[PDB]
């Protein structure tokens, strides 16, 4: 008995469901918002 594998849990797609597309969803709405305040028009 040796070299037992790393025990990934059974909800791995479900984590990549809700962690990747959420962090990028949220990443955008930071950047598109941060862009919109960076060059405003004080004129």
């Amino acid at each position: 008995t040796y070299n037992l594998a790393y025990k990934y849990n059974f909800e791995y797609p479900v984590v990549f469901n809700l962690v990747l597309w959420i962090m990028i969803g949220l990443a955008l709405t930071l950047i598109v918002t941060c862009y919109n305040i960076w060059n405003m028009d004080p004129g």
Binding site: L30, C34, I37, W38, M40, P42
Partner: protein, 150 residues
Amino acid sequence: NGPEYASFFAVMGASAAMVFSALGAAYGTAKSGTGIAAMSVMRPEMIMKSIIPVVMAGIIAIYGLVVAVLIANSLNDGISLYRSFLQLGAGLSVGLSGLAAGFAIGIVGDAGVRGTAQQPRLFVGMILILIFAEVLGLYGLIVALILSTK
């Protein structure tokens, strides 16, 4: 103790509380600093009384410095994944709100010191909007401090 990768989110929160907060202080210094040099050509009398928005923008950086050394002194090997996530959200909610804070200080600090040289009645009103632009970062603390001590 938690997993071996658990320390990654706490040190990310220790960095994102300092990267984003200094970035907010960077825009507040730069956008209001351009208005300083455009004011001094017309009215040379007010230079100490015109650098109120930049010194209030400096507090945004020290807002991030509080939670950064706080998280790093609560940091440990083998921290729980529940414990490590709180310092991440403490890191994001003080920097990105401070980045939002320095965005407001930078804009109204720019146009405020332009109108102050053209009419000094704006100067009492310019600070009063700047306080509302700065306490957004102060709400960044009491979400970060209430999350880090858990």
